[PDB]
């Protein structure tokens, strides 16, 4: 038993994680269902390393130090269950299987429970950062049976991306499918951040009439602020990028972002669990709307809009920046509400501050802002909503006049801002003690005798004869 850990499946992600572990001094046993790929890997990408191969699952298991640790990176679904089924009879009580694939969190929960009953410790782990991240360090979001955590922590935190203060972006997420649930929400959050940047861009371009390189510089300047993030960095670079003919490339690109994307699952989850995650929902629907390109070409010939901007440009640009920041705060508050609800539904204990940290590092959504979210949970690990933390409360308060001006102006100009507007609507709803929803209750009681509750007596259902 000379190998520290094994990894099954030899596509690029798995190869790169293996090499990452190797570079950190761990002896890894590589395996693949088509075993010829093991030899190929050893002869090429793993040439000259400490990586060892196996020609069968039984041999692979035999090479592992106990408790045995086996990572699966294979196609999500049946392939994962089929490897689990083949592995169980070969393992010993206390051995550990980690699924690092793109798995659905309900499958992870099922596997965690079923394997626990068999004496096998199961971890589902989100992995973010793609092929390059896997190679030099991923964000890792492990959850599962926590009995496994002390055994995988050294390897997983060792290979993980680090932030600039040294903390690894990997920590135990929570029970059962929590790690994969967190990866799912991260995917939705990403849609929100990208759509928000698009709305800011649209306002710069069509309200302020800014040049491409001027908008690049605005985003660059913004990146020195509270907004400092990878997505803003690459946006600036994209905006200034010139094609071979000297013309900017971005204006040549088809604006259709797809109807089928994975971000939908976060919005669906929100609806299933009854959580108002409105911004990610609008971001998903905005991609869908963009995919309607031919329909929009036709509509643009038929349907009319409203306008000339007379104000101070620098001031309004700052208003857009603050609208973007405030809207982002609302989006993350919503995403964390979804995490909280899942915890309630399943009885999970979630590491909220750790999740914020894990979303830095290899993740596309990495930002200084995420460090502030970690700070909020570190100040108060019992924090119920991000909006109630003093930093975020102060931020929104300081941004809100700008936010309303940006939205009001965009509305007058006819610029679509589905995410800016949903975020503001949500903020205004959440902060109101009284909402008109009582009228919905009255309507349902009127037409269907559904009843209603009095403010003074919650939990007691009353029918009134309205007619």
Curated annotation (Swiss-Prot):
The modification Phosphoserine is found at residues 56, 128. Pfam families: 6PGD, NAD_binding_2. Keywords: Acetylation, Cytoplasm, Gluconate utilization, NADP, Oxidoreductase, Pentose shunt, Phosphoprotein. GO terms for biological process: D-gluconate metabolic process; pentose biosynthetic process; pentose-phosphate shunt; pentose-phosphate shunt, oxidative branch. It is found in: Cytoplasm. InterPro entries: 6-PGluconate_DH-like_C_sf (IPR008927), 6PGD_dom2 (IPR013328), 6PGDH_C (IPR006114), 6PGDH_Gnd/GntZ (IPR006113), 6PGDH_NADP-bd (IPR006115), 6PGdom_BS (IPR006184), NAD(P)-bd_dom_sf (IPR036291), Pgluconate_DH (IPR006183). SMART domains: 6PGD. Homodimer. This is 6-phosphogluconate dehydrogenase, decarboxylating. It comes from Homo sapiens. The gene is PGD.
């Amino acid at each position: 038993a000379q190998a520290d850990i094994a990894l099954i499946g030899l596509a690029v992600m798995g190869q790169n994680l293996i090499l990452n572990m190797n570079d950190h001094g761990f002896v890894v046993c590589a395996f693949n269902r088509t075993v010829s790929k093991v030899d190929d890997f050893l002869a090429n990408e793993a040439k000259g390393t400490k990586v060892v191969g196996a020609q069968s699952l039984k041999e692979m298991v035999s090479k592992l130090k106990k408790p045995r640790r086996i990572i699966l990176l294979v196609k999500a679904g049946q392939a994962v269950d089929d490897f689990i089924e083949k592995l169980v009879p070969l393992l010993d009580t206390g051995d550990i299987i980690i699924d690092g694939g793109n798995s659905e969190y309900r499958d992870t929960t099922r596997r965690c429970r079923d394997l626990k009953a068999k004496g096998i410790l199961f971890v589902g782990s989100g992995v973010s950062g793609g092929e390059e991240g896997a190679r030099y360090g991923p964000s890792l979001m492990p959850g599962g049976n926590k009995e496994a955590w002390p055994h995988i922590k050294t390897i997983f935190q060792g290979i993980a991306a680090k932030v600039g203060t040294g903390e690894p972006c990997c920590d135990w997420v929570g029970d059962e499918g929590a790690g994969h649930f967190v990866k799912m929400v991260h995917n939705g959050i990403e849609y929100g951040d990208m759509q928000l940047i698009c709305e800011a861009y649209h306002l710069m371009k069509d309200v302020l009439g800014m040049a491409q390189d001027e908008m690049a510089q605005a985003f660059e300047d913004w990146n020195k602020t509270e907004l400092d993030s990878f997505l803003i960095e690459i946006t600036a670079n994209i905006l200034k990028f010139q094609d071979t003919d000297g013309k900017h490339l971005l204006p040549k690109i088809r604006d259709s972002a797809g109807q089928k994307g994975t971000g939908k699952w976060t919005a669906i989850s929100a609806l299933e669990y009854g959580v108002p995650v409105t911004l990610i929902g609008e971001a998903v629907f905005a991609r869908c709307l963009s995919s309607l390109k031919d329909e929009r070409i036709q509509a643009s010939k038929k349907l009319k809009g409203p306008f000339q901007f007379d104000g101070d440009k620098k001031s309004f640009l700052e208003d857009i920046r603050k609208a973007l920041y405030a809207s982002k705060i609302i989006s993350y508050a919503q995403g964390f509400m979804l995490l909280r609800q899942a915890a309630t539904e399943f009885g999970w204990t979630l590491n909220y501050g750790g999740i914020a940290l894990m979303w830095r590092g290899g993740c596309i959504i990495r930002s200084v802002f995420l460090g502030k979210i970690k700070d909020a949970f570190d100040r108060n690990p019992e924090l119920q909503n991000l909006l109630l933390d003093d930093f975020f409360k102060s931020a929104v308060e300081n941004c809100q006049d700008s936010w309303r001006r940006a939205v009001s102006t965009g509305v007058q100009a006819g610029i679509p801002m589905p995410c800016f507007t949903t975020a503001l609507s949500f903020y205004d709803g959440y902060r109101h003690e009284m909402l008109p929803a009582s009228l919905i209750q009255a309507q349902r009681d009127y037409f269907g005798a559904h009843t209603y509750e009095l403010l003074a007596k919650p939990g007691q259902f009353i029918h009134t004869n309205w007619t």
